[PDB]
Design a protein around this nucleic acid. Sequence first.
RNA 1: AAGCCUCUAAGCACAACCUGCGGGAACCCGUACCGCAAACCGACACAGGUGGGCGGGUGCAAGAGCACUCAGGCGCGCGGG
RNA 2: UGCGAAUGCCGGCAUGAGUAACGAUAAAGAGGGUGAGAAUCCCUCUCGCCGUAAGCCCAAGGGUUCCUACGCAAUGGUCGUCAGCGUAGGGUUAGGCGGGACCUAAGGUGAAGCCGAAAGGCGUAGCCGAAGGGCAGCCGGUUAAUAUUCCGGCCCUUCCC
RNA 3: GAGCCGGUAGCGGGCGUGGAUCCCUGGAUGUCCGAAUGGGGGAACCCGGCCGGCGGGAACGCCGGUCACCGCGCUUUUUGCGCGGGGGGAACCUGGGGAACUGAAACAUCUCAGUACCCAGAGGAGAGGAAAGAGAAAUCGACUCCCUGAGUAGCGGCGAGCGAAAGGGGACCAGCCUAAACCGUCCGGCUUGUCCGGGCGGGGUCGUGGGGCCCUCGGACACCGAAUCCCCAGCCUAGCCGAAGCUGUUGGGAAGCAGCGCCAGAGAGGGUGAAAGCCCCGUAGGCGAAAGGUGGGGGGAUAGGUGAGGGUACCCGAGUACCCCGUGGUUCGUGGAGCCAUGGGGGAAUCUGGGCGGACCACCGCCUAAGGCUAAGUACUCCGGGUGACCGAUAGCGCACCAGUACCGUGAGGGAAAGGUGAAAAGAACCCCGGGAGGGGAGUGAAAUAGAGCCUGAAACCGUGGGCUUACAAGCAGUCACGGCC
Lengths: 94, 97, 66, 104
Amino acid sequence: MKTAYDVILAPVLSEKAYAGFAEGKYTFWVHPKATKTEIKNAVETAFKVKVVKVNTLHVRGKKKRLGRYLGKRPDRKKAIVQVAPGQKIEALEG
Amino acid sequence: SKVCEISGKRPIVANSIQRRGKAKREGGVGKKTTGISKRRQYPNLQKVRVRVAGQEITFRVAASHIPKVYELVERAKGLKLEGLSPKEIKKELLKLL
Amino acid sequence: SEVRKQLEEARKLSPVELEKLVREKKRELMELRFQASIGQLSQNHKIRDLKRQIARLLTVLNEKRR
Amino acid sequence: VKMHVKKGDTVLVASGKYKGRVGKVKEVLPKKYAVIVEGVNIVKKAVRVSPKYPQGGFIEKEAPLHASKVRPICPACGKPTRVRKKFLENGKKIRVCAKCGGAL
RNA sequence: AAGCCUCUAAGCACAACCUGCGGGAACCCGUACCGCAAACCGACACAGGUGGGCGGGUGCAAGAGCACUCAGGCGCGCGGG
RNA sequence: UGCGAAUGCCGGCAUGAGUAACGAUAAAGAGGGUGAGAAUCCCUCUCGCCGUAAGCCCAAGGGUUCCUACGCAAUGGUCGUCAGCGUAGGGUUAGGCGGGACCUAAGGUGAAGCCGAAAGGCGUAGCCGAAGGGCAGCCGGUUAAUAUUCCGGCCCUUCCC
RNA sequence: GAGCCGGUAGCGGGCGUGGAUCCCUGGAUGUCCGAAUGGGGGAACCCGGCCGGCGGGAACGCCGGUCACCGCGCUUUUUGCGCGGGGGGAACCUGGGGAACUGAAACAUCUCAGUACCCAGAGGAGAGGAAAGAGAAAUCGACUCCCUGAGUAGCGGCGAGCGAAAGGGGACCAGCCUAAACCGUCCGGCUUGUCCGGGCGGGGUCGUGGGGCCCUCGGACACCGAAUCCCCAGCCUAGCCGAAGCUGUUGGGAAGCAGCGCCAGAGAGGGUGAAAGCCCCGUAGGCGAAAGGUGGGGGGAUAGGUGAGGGUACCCGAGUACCCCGUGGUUCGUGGAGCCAUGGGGGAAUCUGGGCGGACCACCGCCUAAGGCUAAGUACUCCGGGUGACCGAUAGCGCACCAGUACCGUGAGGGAAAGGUGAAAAGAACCCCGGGAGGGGAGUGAAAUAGAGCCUGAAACCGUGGGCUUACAAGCAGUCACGGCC
Ligand SMILES: [Mg+2]
Ligand SMILES: [Mg+2]
Ligand SMILES: [Mg+2]
Ligand SMILES: [Mg+2]
Ligand SMILES: [Mg+2]
Ligand SMILES: [Mg+2]
Ligand SMILES: [Mg+2]
Ligand SMILES: [Mg+2]
Ligand SMILES: [Mg+2]
Ligand SMILES: [Mg+2]
Ligand SMILES: [Mg+2]
Ligand SMILES: [Mg+2]
Ligand SMILES: [Mg+2]
Ligand SMILES: [Mg+2]
Ligand SMILES: [Mg+2]
Ligand SMILES: [Mg+2]
Ligand SMILES: [Mg+2]
Ligand SMILES: [Mg+2]
Ligand SMILES: [Mg+2]
Ligand SMILES: [Mg+2]
Ligand SMILES: [Mg+2]
Ligand SMILES: [Mg+2]
Ligand SMILES: [Mg+2]
Ligand SMILES: [Mg+2]
Ligand SMILES: [Mg+2]
Ligand SMILES: [Mg+2]
Ligand SMILES: [Mg+2]
Ligand SMILES: [Mg+2]
Ligand SMILES: [Mg+2]
Ligand SMILES: [Mg+2]
Ligand SMILES: [Mg+2]
Ligand SMILES: [Mg+2]
Ligand SMILES: [Mg+2]
Ligand SMILES: [Mg+2]
Ligand SMILES: [Mg+2]
Ligand SMILES: [Mg+2]
Ligand SMILES: [Mg+2]
Ligand SMILES: [Mg+2]
Ligand SMILES: [Mg+2]
Ligand SMILES: [Mg+2]
Ligand SMILES: [Mg+2]
Ligand SMILES: [Mg+2]
Ligand SMILES: [Mg+2]
Ligand SMILES: [Mg+2]
Ligand SMILES: [Mg+2]
Ligand SMILES: [Mg+2]
Ligand SMILES: [Mg+2]
Ligand SMILES: [Mg+2]
Ligand SMILES: [Mg+2]
Ligand SMILES: [Mg+2]
Ligand SMILES: [Mg+2]
Ligand SMILES: [Mg+2]
Ligand SMILES: [Mg+2]
Ligand SMILES: [Mg+2]
Ligand SMILES: [Mg+2]
Ligand SMILES: [Mg+2]
Ligand SMILES: [Mg+2]
Ligand SMILES: [Mg+2]
Ligand SMILES: [Mg+2]
Ligand SMILES: [Mg+2]
Ligand SMILES: [Mg+2]
Ligand SMILES: [Mg+2]
Ligand SMILES: [Mg+2]
Ligand SMILES: [Mg+2]
Ligand SMILES: [Mg+2]
Ligand SMILES: [Mg+2]
Ligand SMILES: [Mg+2]
Ligand SMILES: [Mg+2]
Ligand SMILES: [Mg+2]
Ligand SMILES: [Mg+2]
Ligand SMILES: [Mg+2]
Ligand SMILES: [Mg+2]
Ligand SMILES: [Mg+2]
Ligand SMILES: [Mg+2]
Ligand SMILES: [Mg+2]
Ligand SMILES: [Mg+2]
Ligand SMILES: [Mg+2]
Ligand SMILES: [Mg+2]
Ligand SMILES: [Mg+2]
Ligand SMILES: [Mg+2]
Ligand SMILES: [Mg+2]
Ligand SMILES: [Mg+2]
Ligand SMILES: [Mg+2]
Ligand SMILES: [Mg+2]
Ligand SMILES: [Mg+2]
Ligand SMILES: [Mg+2]
Ligand SMILES: [Mg+2]
Ligand SMILES: [Mg+2]
Ligand SMILES: [Mg+2]
Ligand SMILES: [Mg+2]
Ligand SMILES: [Mg+2]
Ligand SMILES: [Mg+2]
Ligand SMILES: [Mg+2]
Ligand SMILES: [Mg+2]
Ligand SMILES: [Mg+2]
Ligand SMILES: [Mg+2]
Ligand SMILES: [Mg+2]
Ligand SMILES: [Mg+2]
Ligand SMILES: [Mg+2]
Ligand SMILES: [Mg+2]
Ligand SMILES: [Mg+2]
Ligand SMILES: [Mg+2]
Ligand SMILES: [Mg+2]
Ligand SMILES: [Mg+2]
Ligand SMILES: [Mg+2]
Ligand SMILES: [Mg+2]
Ligand SMILES: [Mg+2]
Ligand SMILES: [Mg+2]
Ligand SMILES: [Mg+2]
Ligand SMILES: [Mg+2]
Ligand SMILES: [Mg+2]
Ligand SMILES: [Mg+2]
Ligand SMILES: [Zn+2]
C-alpha cells in the first residue's frame, strides 16, 4: 500500500555492513524500484531518525543450479543510509 | 489508390493476348496465341477542382463520372468548414439513408 | 474462529481506521522479517498469516470504497 | 479421492501377511491411497548413529497398507461394505453388514 | 543545434529578470572481474583476429628501431632419459 | 508381415595402437611446507624470458569469471592437495566519472501533404539519433573484495525559497 | 466430509467437524512489457503535463487519477462530449492479388492451378439467397449441402488433358426492409415561388405486372405474427446414491484351487502381493445448482402483415441498360460465341418500358437489372468427451521424461536424445579394507548377477578358467576320410 514498511525489506548482515554502524551508516535490503528519495522518508518514518545521505546499489542474482535445472536468485538492491549526527538505529544494534 | 472517388472504379488486372494468323472466318486456318500476360487497366482518372462555399475542393475522378462532381455542387446547404467539405459532400450526399 | 471474527470486526470499522490498521500490521510484518533475517528469533507461520491478514484487511477496505 | 475408512476407524486387514488382524487406523494417506493401521503392519528400518538414538541401529515402524487391503470393522461384525442414509440435513455411513454405526 | 550574450514581442510592470549573500533541495542507470586475452571473435585454457591512452633507463647519428635492463609480468598445464 | 548389402538410417562396440599427438625451442634447479597421495600446490633461494611489453590505464564485448571458506567426480591435453572447476558466504556506494530528466549529425521517423491493387512507399516542419557539441572534483587514506563513488582535506554546479 | 500447508521429503512451525485442504460459480487484487494508447524507446526501460494526495516539502521523490491516433454522431465550428475502431486466434471461410517445378515423354498455346503463397476482412461458422433464373416442359420455382445426372454435353497445339448444367433423388426450410410517385414537417438558398435543395415521418415494395393520385364498394370483431424482447423447460460449468462371500488350502502374497453361498436393469473396465460379478474404484439404473453460461425447444409480448371495380399514365434504382473496344468468368483456348462481369468511348427509356431462351431476324415464351438484409441444412478442430482387428519408447506427436528445451545458426530458422528397483523403501544400521569411489561381512527381501550405472538383459565387443590343438609349412579357411587326445 502506502508502503513504507514495504520499501524496507531487511537489514543486510555482513562484516561489511556492521562496520558501518560505527559511523552513522545503516544498510538495508530495499525494494528494487525505490528511489533514493523515497528510501530516505521510508527510514525517517520507520525508525524515527533523520536521514542525511542515501547511497544505493543494485545486486544481481547469482545463477544457481539444483542439477540439470539452472536458474538465478532474485536481483536485489541495497541502500546504505547516513543518519544525522549522534542519532542511531537501535533496531540494528544487535 | 488510383481509384475514382465518386464511381469507386479502380485498376483491374487484364491479360494482353498476342495472336497470329488469319481468322477462321476469313478462311484462315484460324488465329493462334503467341503470348498471354497480365497487364492492368487503370480508370481514366482526372482532377476536378471546384469551388464550394468558401473553399476550393479537389476531387480525383474517372473522367467518366466527371459530371457527378457538378451534381454534388448543385447540392448546397450550410458548410462553413475547411477542406472536408467533400467528406460531407461525398457518400453522405451520394447515398445516405 | 479467529479469522472469522477478525474479518467480522474489520467490517463496521471503516476505512481510515482500516488503512491505519494495515499500516500497523505492515510494520508488524516488517519487524517479523527482521527477526527471521537475524535468524532464530522467529517461529514462522506468523509471517505467513500476517501477510494474509493484511490481504483480508485490504480486501475489506476495497469493499467499503466500491 | 473418496476412500472408505477414516482415522478414528477400526479396521480388519483383509489380505497379505497381516491378513486376518484387526487394529485401529493410525493414519490415512489419500495421495498414496494407503491407510496405516497399527501395529498391524510393521517393518524394520536401519537408522544412522547421528543424534537421538545416537547408538541406535534400528527402529520398528508401521508401513502403509494399500487402502484396499483393509475393511471397516462394523461394531459387532467384521463385514460390511458401507451404505448411506440421509434424514436431515445430510451425511451418513452405515453398515450394510447389516445394520450399524460409524459414528466412530 | 543547444548552452551562452544581445534585441525586442505579446504580456506583465504590488510581476519579472540581473547581482550578491544566505538557508534548503539535488532523481534514474552504470560501477565486481577479464579485457592483444585461459574470461572478447575464432566448436578448444586454439602460435590467428581485436579500437584508444601511458609505455622508464643506457648505448648505438635520430627514433616508438636494435640490444640489455626498471617497475611490473612471465618460463607458455606432460614429464624423465 | 520376414533384410545382409542401398558410400542406407539410429545406436553400440571394434581395427589402426598403447601408435601419432599432449598446441610455439623464453628453461629450468634445489630446499622447506602441506597432504592419503606432489615434477605439476604454497614459501625461500638460484637460473632463464618479456620490457613501445609478454607492464599499466580506457572503450567494446563477456556476464560472477571477482574475494573467501570447504572441496577433486568431472572440466584442465599429464599430475593436482591447485584452478578461470563443484558447494556456500560475501563483494560493485557518485549533485561533480559515463549515460539519461541538454543539443543537433548521417540516417531514421514523421501533424501537413503526395503516391500506391492490399501490404505499403514517400515527405515539410517536428521528433529520435553521438566516440561530435554543452556540463560542476582534485590529492590521499581505507576493504579479503569498491572507491574522482566511502573517508580526510581543499574546491565547485544547478534548482527552490 | 477428514484430513491439510502444490511437484517435495526434510528442518522449523501451523491449520481443520465452530467443517479445513480440495472442486465449481462469482467477485477482488492484478508490478512491467505487449494493439500498447501521455511521450520516448535497443519490448518488459526511460522522460513528462494536468488534478489530487503523502514527507519538513518550494526545489526532490512517491502515490491515485487523467492525457495517443482514427471513424461516426450530435453540438454555436469552437469549450467539447458520447459511442465505436485498432490487436490476437488451430484449421475452416470470403475477397484483393497470384507462381513454378511438373505434364505435354522436347516446347511456346495448353497443363500444374486460380494451386502454393502473400494481403485485407469475417465469424463460430463464412459464402450464398428470395429470379431482369432456368431452358423446352405451357415446365420448374430463393440459397446452400449430399447422391445422381456423368467422365455425359462439350472444351482441346481436337494433343497432353480439361470438364459443366437442366432434370431426378435427398438434407434443410423463410422470407423481409427499402428507392421513386404522392402527402406531410423542419431547415437552407433565395430573382417568397403552386420554387428549388437537403433532413425527418408517413406512404409504397411487386411479374396472374405492381404501386401512387381520383371515384365507387362497408370495409366492421378481425385473423396472421416475427429472424426482436420477456419467462420457462432442457443442456454446460462441481457432485451424489448405487446390488451380492465367507471359510479352508498352497504360497512372500489368493484374486488360484477346494467347500458351501449370494447379486445381477450392474458378468463394461481398472485396482488390490498372482487369476476377484459379490475387497476397493466403478458399472446398470437413478439423482443433483445458490451462482455464471446457454437456451435453435415451450410460453407470452411487441414489430410487421392482410381487399374489390373503374378512371387517370404520376413512379417503378443512370454515366446504368444498350452498342463498340480491351479482358475475366463459364465446359466454351475467337470459335457460328451468346450469357454473367467490367478498364475505355458513345450513351437511352419507365409497361406501349426493359433483360433472356447460344451470332442475327421473325414468331412464341421466360423474367423484371442498375439498393439492402435474411435462420437452417454446410466447412473446420485450438478445445472437452467416447470409441479403435491404432502405436507401444528407433513405434506413436518433434516431446510418455521440466521440449519447441538443450544445442546449432547473425537471423529467418533448425532442432535431439532421455521411460521401467520393489508388492512395500523394507533405499542396506553396525563392523572391515579404503583419502574417497568401491567392495567384504551384517541386515532387508519370495528374489539383491531386483542394490538405485537397479525388470527382462540378446549380439557385436573385452576378459578369467578349463579341454583339444599349434613353432619345416602356404592360405576364400571349408569340406570328405582316417587316425590321435578329452
Ligand atoms: Mg549509483
Ligand atoms: Mg492487347
Ligand atoms: Mg479540371
Ligand atoms: Mg463517357
Ligand atoms: Mg479458523
Ligand atoms: Mg460396490
Ligand atoms: Mg454438508
Ligand atoms: Mg531545438
Ligand atoms: Mg545557494
Ligand atoms: Mg568500481
Ligand atoms: Mg575496477
Ligand atoms: Mg592496446
Ligand atoms: Mg596481461
Ligand atoms: Mg587472464
Ligand atoms: Mg595452454
Ligand atoms: Mg590466443
Ligand atoms: Mg578462446
Ligand atoms: Mg592492432
Ligand atoms: Mg618516451
Ligand atoms: Mg628507450
Ligand atoms: Mg637516448
Ligand atoms: Mg642508431
Ligand atoms: Mg623493441
Ligand atoms: Mg585398438
Ligand atoms: Mg605403426
Ligand atoms: Mg614411432
Ligand atoms: Mg611421440
Ligand atoms: Mg604445452
Ligand atoms: Mg610444448
Ligand atoms: Mg625500454
Ligand atoms: Mg561491459
Ligand atoms: Mg563465452
Ligand atoms: Mg560460476
Ligand atoms: Mg579467483
Ligand atoms: Mg582452498
Ligand atoms: Mg579433478
Ligand atoms: Mg586430469
Ligand atoms: Mg568457484
Ligand atoms: Mg560528491
Ligand atoms: Mg533526449
Ligand atoms: Mg534530442
Ligand atoms: Mg517512411
Ligand atoms: Mg554525447
Ligand atoms: Mg561528449
Ligand atoms: Mg559530467
Ligand atoms: Mg585513490
Ligand atoms: Mg580490484
Ligand atoms: Mg568526499
Ligand atoms: Mg512437519
Ligand atoms: Mg457447507
Ligand atoms: Mg475465480
Ligand atoms: Mg495493490
Ligand atoms: Mg508507452
Ligand atoms: Mg502521469
Ligand atoms: Mg511510441
Ligand atoms: Mg501535485
Ligand atoms: Mg483481425
Ligand atoms: Mg477481430
Ligand atoms: Mg482468392
Ligand atoms: Mg511452365
Ligand atoms: Mg519449364
Ligand atoms: Mg515436359
Ligand atoms: Mg517428359
Ligand atoms: Mg528440356
Ligand atoms: Mg485453370
Ligand atoms: Mg469478427
Ligand atoms: Mg450464417
Ligand atoms: Mg449477403
Ligand atoms: Mg481448369
Ligand atoms: Mg439437381
Ligand atoms: Mg421453398
Ligand atoms: Mg420509409
Ligand atoms: Mg420540399
Ligand atoms: Mg422517406
Ligand atoms: Mg416505412
Ligand atoms: Mg397500372
Ligand atoms: Mg459408491
Ligand atoms: Mg503358509
Ligand atoms: Mg480367501
Ligand atoms: Mg490352474
Ligand atoms: Mg477387473
Ligand atoms: Mg480365472
Ligand atoms: Mg475385478
Ligand atoms: Mg451414473
Ligand atoms: Mg409515366
Ligand atoms: Mg445483350
Ligand atoms: Mg476464357
Ligand atoms: Mg470468353
Ligand atoms: Mg486453338
Ligand atoms: Mg440474345
Ligand atoms: Mg443484359
Ligand atoms: Mg432464359
Ligand atoms: Mg427466364
Ligand atoms: Mg427494377
Ligand atoms: Mg431487388
Ligand atoms: Mg449470412
Ligand atoms: Mg480431442
Ligand atoms: Mg528409448
Ligand atoms: Mg521417439
Ligand atoms: Mg525396450
Ligand atoms: Mg523424435
Ligand atoms: Mg544462439
Ligand atoms: Mg532371509
Ligand atoms: Mg551381495
Ligand atoms: Mg538373473
Ligand atoms: Mg530380478
Ligand atoms: Mg515387475
Ligand atoms: Mg538388470
Ligand atoms: Mg582362454
Ligand atoms: Mg625343408
Ligand atoms: Mg611340426
Ligand atoms: Mg603366413
Ligand atoms: Zn454390523
